[PDB]
Amino acid sequence: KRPIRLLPWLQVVKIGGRVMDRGADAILPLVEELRKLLPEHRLLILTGAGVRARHVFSVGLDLGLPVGSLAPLAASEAGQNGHILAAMLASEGVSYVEHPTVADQLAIHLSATRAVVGSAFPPYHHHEFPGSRIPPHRADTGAFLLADAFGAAGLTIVENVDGIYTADPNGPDRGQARFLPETSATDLAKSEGPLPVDRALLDVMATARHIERVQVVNGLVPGRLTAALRGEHVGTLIRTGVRPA
C-alpha cells in the first residue's frame, strides 16, 4: 500500500513571490479573495520569494557563495512575503507559522483557526543539492513536497501569468508562445526552455504518492483561485503521474 494521508481535508495554495512583488494593486484583491475562501476550505497558504531573492543571489554569487549558502538566503524572502500576507489577514484570525510548526503542529493550528501562512521554501538550507549554482528546491518544489507528504486534497499554484506556455510569454520569443491548458510532468521535464515552475517540481512529481494533478492559475485575475480550488479548469493542469489506488 501507499502511505496513509495525514491531512486528507487540507488544501495547499502557493502564492508566487512575483505576485507579492506587485504590491497593493495585486495583494489587496488577492487578500479579499482569500478572506472569502476562509469559510469554504481549510487552507495552508505558502509564499514564494520573488525579486528580492534574485538580488540576494546576485550579491551572494558575486561573493562566490555556494548553493547551500544561497538557499537559506532566498528562503528568508519567502518568509517575509508570508509575514506580509498574514498581517493583511490578521483581523480574520490568520497568522504566519514557522516550518517546525508546519511540520509537527499543523493539525492543531488548523483546528484553532481557518488558515495559516508559512514559507513555501523547504528547509534544505546548507544541505541543498550541488550541481547548479542556483538552489534547485525552491517554493513550488517545497509546497508540493509538503502537500504530497500530508496527502492533501490539492496544491494550487498562483502565479502572475495564465499558466504554462510553449515559450516565456514575457520573453523575447513571446510571439511564438502558445498556451498549454494541460500537460504532464514527464512531457514538461523533456522540454528545454524556461517555465513558470521549478524544474525540481517535475522531479518530485515523478515520485509523488498522492497528488494526481496541480493547477497553475493567474492570481492577478480575481476569481481564478476560487474556481481552481473547486476543481474548475481556469489555468494549466499538470498531471503528476500518480495513478489511483
Binding site: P3, F129, P194, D198
Partner: protein, 268 residues
Amino acid sequence: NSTAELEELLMQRSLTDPQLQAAAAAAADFRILPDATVIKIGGQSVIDRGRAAVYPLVDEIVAARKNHKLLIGTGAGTRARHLYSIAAGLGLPAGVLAQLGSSVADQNAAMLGQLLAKHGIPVVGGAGLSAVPLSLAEVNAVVFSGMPPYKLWMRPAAEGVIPPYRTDAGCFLLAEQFGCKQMIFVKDEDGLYTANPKTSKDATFIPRISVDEMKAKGLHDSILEFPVLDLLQSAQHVREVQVVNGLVPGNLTRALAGEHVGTIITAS
C-alpha cells in the same frame, strides 16, 4: 560575462532559464572551510557496538585534532531501523520517518559528545552552527548529528517509505557545502568489496573505483547510501570520498595522514 550581465539575467528571467543557469555557473567559487575534514562515524557499524569500538575512536579524534580540523558527524543505527519498521508498518510517509531517524543520530552525537567534552570538543547544531567557526578555531573539532534537515520535506525513494537521504548523505552534503578538503566514512569493513563481505565468502577488495564503474558492477547501494554516489558526481568541491574500517586501531589517523587505507570512490 560580467557582474552586470548576470545581474540583468537574474532580474529578467525565470530561475529555470537555461541562459541564467549558465551565467550563474561562471561565478566565483568560495570555499567556506577549506582546511577541514568531515568524518562520518557509523551508527550501526561503530556506535551501536559500544565502548570496544567507540573508545579507541575517541582516543584517535583527540590525538588527530592536534594536526587536523575535524567535523565529526554521527550515524543512527539499530534504533532508527526499529523506528522505521514501526512507522512503515503504520503506513507513515518517508518525511515522517526522516524526523524519527534524526532523533537517533542526535542521541548518538550526545553520547559521543559526552566522551569528548573534557577535551573541549562540543556538540553543535543544537543551539546553532556558527558554533562551528569558533569551535574549529579553538579546539579543532566539533561533533554534529549526521541526518539532513529535510524532515517532512524529504524527497521519497522511487519505491518504499525509507528516507533515501540519511546520515551518509547528510555528512557528504555538509562537506560539499563548506568546500572541505576531504570526506571520510568510518564503517566496520575495510572498504568496498565486489559483494557484501558479511554475506559472501569470496568477495574481492576494491582499493579505488569511480561511481560509473560501481554502477556497472551492481554496487550502487552497497557500502554507501546509493544517492550519495549521485550527489558525488554533481559535487563542486568534494569529488572523491574515502571509506575506512573504524574497528582497526589507527585507521582514521592514517587516513587523515594521506595513507591509502580503505577504498577511494571517485566522481569520475
